Symmetry: D5
Subunit: 155 residues, 10 copies
């Protein structure tokens, strides 16, 4: 599997992908049909944050009219990071940034209390988002972060 | 309810609290017994990120030997933010920072797709962390971020 | 409704829009005639900070000679943020930045005093700017920031 | 009237003031009674962003048990700025920071359209906040930014 | 009068202007002939920091062979700021930056002593530079900053 | 003459000086009587940006009740810089910062036109501020920057 | 095991430890005797980057004359990060920082080629340093970074 | 031997090289066959961080279809630095960044203990990565940093 | 003599110069033959940091096949600074950056001790570099920084 | 030989040294009498940038009335760097900073031309400053930076 150490070719691809998605008026859920992969993972890959396996890459390429150069690029491991400069201004992204700003030390404390010294991994890791009703009317998003605990032991 | 626009008084209190917790070899779970509140909310308050209502404030104060000045301060709305400078270096906190760097654009894309224009709130919001076994051996943390959808609509 | 996680497409559109606006010597008030929406909301949309509903997108498109790709793009939720880098140097924008720098702690203190723990929303939110004569000669701008109170409550 | 070019003494005073306010459980509204000044201005001065005239100073000092050294310092013109580092993390302050991030270019555009070249002043300027009921239930804050237009003219 | 909230189109015009000036080997003094306006103001406009009134724009355009699109853009209010990133590295500009770094606190102090609370305006403001002989041989520059005093008054 | 490469001892002295000035309700003008030096230079020195010659140092020390350690320290060359972090938030200081942000390129351009390649010195340099009436009512500050031209020549 | 979300108490212990070590003229090798742990791990713990298990803590405390408050603190999980601000100026540290700046893209590329998508872990991880003779005379340091490969797999 | 003080032309070459590598689905190991150089050095050079000697340059160029301008450019000493901004967000690169953030002070301390005052060179220096099995299953990367000790001595 | 307040046209010229130097395999020493100017000055000008007198411009242009527009631009005063962002990552440049980081305070201390208050000029200034043998084997660079002392005196 | 990974103890020692030097009105040259070491090295050590051999430490200690704990600390290897935050504001230090900003790329270009790939060392390195008459009146400083060339060789 190929990889890239800089983001501009993948950003170009992502732009090609989004213009096609917008022009065709598609959703990510529809684009993900028949990929054999979860919506969060594929969306992230279309947005330039993951490689797709070859067959998944071809499925989405069929729906967005991507050529073979794009299909190859879609298979490459990218230089990751979806917030240029690290600090988001977009309110939608910023709210998630803010959750970590506020609860970061709480997360550290409760990880060390319930698991021990070490980390919750962001690589052995799955993310999903679910829409649920709010009892007081309206709707809520429940975002689940599921990471493996990796301990820090004396060596 | 009182509030502060600067962080040093709560930081001083948080340090008082942590030294006591360490001296008495207590856990956050133990300190939270009887508050009638969630562990994540009360831990966050002890770490300077929330005000406690007075009953919960007195409950934690007894466990930690906190005086009436400390109890008053625990009831004040703080200046929130748990990562000085915004960018963490501690690996445990960084992993959660990293999840947002990588999946931020995905989180935005799918919120907009499944909800609409707007945000998932970081204020009308609940967080909890659960430990579950990994089938392959070891442990996993499942962190739930649960926020109200707030639409952006024209005016 | 489509969305974008990067700003370059809307930036290009915004530049197309401003060049047309300047060539035709139009005002934002005249471009907004017929949209059934507030001047500030539609101006911000033209400047790449909001999506327009299709009716309003077509109305402004006619005045500016915008094609169908441009009309589709005007309807996409953008990656928001109108000050590159966060810190403005333009004096006009900087004065509003300075108002928050100076009165930020005061706004916090009084929000918590008069409403309680929580925030004044920037999403459930309206802005408008009004021109009124100054008695001493000259003119004043009255800018109204109108946001919903959202409480922070224990969980 | 005296002035200071560094903030720490005034920071110390502000801390003294807030600890007495919390200890006595006072509101800013109560503290401001009989000062002859607006709540926003006096709150800002207590929080270290403005001098108070001598008599207003003595009035608040009586209520907060401040001595003559504090009364003298309350009258000094401070080094202004209430967000250390300029970028707030506290959600309540951040929301107002965000309004300028999002609507900054719109504010510039409509100022130039409706007034002309120049600025809306942050000095010949008044701020206030009102609490108004929301028709759909709940409460809203209406913050008014009232600034003199200062034109830029060719010299 | 039109305005822009982003600098790139104006930056492009400024480059066109500077390439014309270098090609024809003009001085700003010679370009300014017949504008009826001050050299510092018109120079700043050419370098992208001010609009020109139409007559002055046509005068300088004739000398630099600018077309109607340029003349029109030269009349637009720009996004101001002449130092990308705020901190200059060019020694000539840096010296002026350094004067403010060193004397900033003195300026504040003497403003409040001699005028009172408030600012010296950077908008109701004129700048000029004069060359005068140094008695010991060589030359001095006398740069004059002439701004309106705007008081801060309790409200 | 002695020098310091770090600022904390002068900052402490400057604080002592200011607390005495505020306590005695002195002006800088009164403090400067009989120093044989200009107000801007001595004010800068009091604010920790310059050394004073021994006798000027003693003249100001008599007025502010400084001992012989302060008098010795007043004669030391400091680590200069009066804006911590370089970017001011205080509106009074910021306006002078903003003059350089806006007119920086103009100053460079006119310096090279009228003098040639090189710089206007910030060292072989004098500053002064004057208060003059505004014919349209009110008052203006005229700040004079008087620097020696230092050419850049091929070597 | 206890943990701290802020560095100040551990920084104080580290200072105590370093002053003892310097005063007694001890080496990290001599302090590590009888811990049963690697020199690099225990050194990092003494410098505030890891907790020690109790036995090791008591062993090193005996050699440094640390009391029980310190032995308890030495067992707590710290807020990790040994370079304030992230960017080192000290030449010895900077060279290691430099290796990553230069070879960072190479490490990425070869990790993805030889292992696949994912990371080399900084947690399931051992470091050691060895001194070896340079044949040309002089000495070399062979620093070994030994981390678990954690794959990124599509989900 | 030629050199460049800016990175863009080398970044363009690097993009050309990567696009050919991805197109032909080559590995760095395959590309490196017959260069007479180690994998880490040649990979670094291909990625813009090192010059290649002429014959090695021609060997890789034959495999990637690079012309003579590319071959000349491959032989130039570049402006080194592989992480724009210095701080990586890509998890693979960040992990190596993190090892230095956490073990920085430890590396310094043990260099001075085992070698003395001075540095471990990043120039008289060799890097290599090795894949080894993990006893508990899976795989480990062993990265070797091999640098010359350069002493600091009184002069 | 003409000047530029932005670097892009000069950066383009520098690139044209370097692509020709690499294509023709020239040295700076060779390009400089017959300018009657020091190697350090002309190299800096070729790299965009100085104007050349017309004669030198035409001499170097002949060797690099530069047209008249290039010759004209080589004579313009540039916006100076050779390290984008101020902090170099390239190791060759960084070592010189590091010398100032380490010896900055010593340089200040000894300048004031041996000369007095004021500066060593970076404008009335010459730089040169000499290759000399190291007695212990190898070579040393002796870089000479030759600047005029400009006093700071009380005014 | 002891070392430290943080600067505060050495900063305190340096303050003690400077306060003694000022009180006794000593020069660095006088403090350095009898060390056997160059003025530049010993001045840097006193300012916290190098360790002294015990003999030199005790010599300078006798002149400054330093106790035994200070003598011990003076022999420790420090965490080096003499400009907090890396970017100087003090004009005297900034001029040296500026020389590297302007001539950085030229130094790189000529190092590679005259030596080859690699660096000029900042560690195998000597610094000195000489006062020289200016032929046209006044004084000059000649700062000599003398470093070992370290080659970068393909491996």
């Amino acid at each position: 599997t190929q990889s890239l150490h800089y983001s501009s070719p993948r950003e170009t691809l992502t732009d090609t992908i989004m213009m096609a998605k917008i022009r065709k008026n598609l959703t990510f859920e529809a684009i993900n049909q028949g990929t054999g992969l979860s919506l969060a993972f594929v969306t992230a890959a279309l947005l330039g944050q993951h490689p797709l396996p070859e067959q998944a890459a071809r499925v989405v390429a069929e729906k967005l009219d991507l050529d073979e150069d794009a299909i190859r690029l879609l298979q490459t491991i990218p230089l990751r990071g979806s917030i240029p400069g690290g600090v988001p201004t977009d309110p939608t992204i910023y709210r998630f940034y803010e959750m970590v700003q506020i609860y970061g030390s709480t997360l550290k404390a409760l990880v060390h209390e319930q698991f021990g010294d070490g980390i919750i991994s962001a690589i052995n890791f799955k993310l999903d988002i679910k829409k649920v009703p709010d009892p007081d009317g309206g709707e809520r998003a429940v975002i689940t972060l599921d990471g493996k605990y990796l301990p820090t032991k004396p060596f």
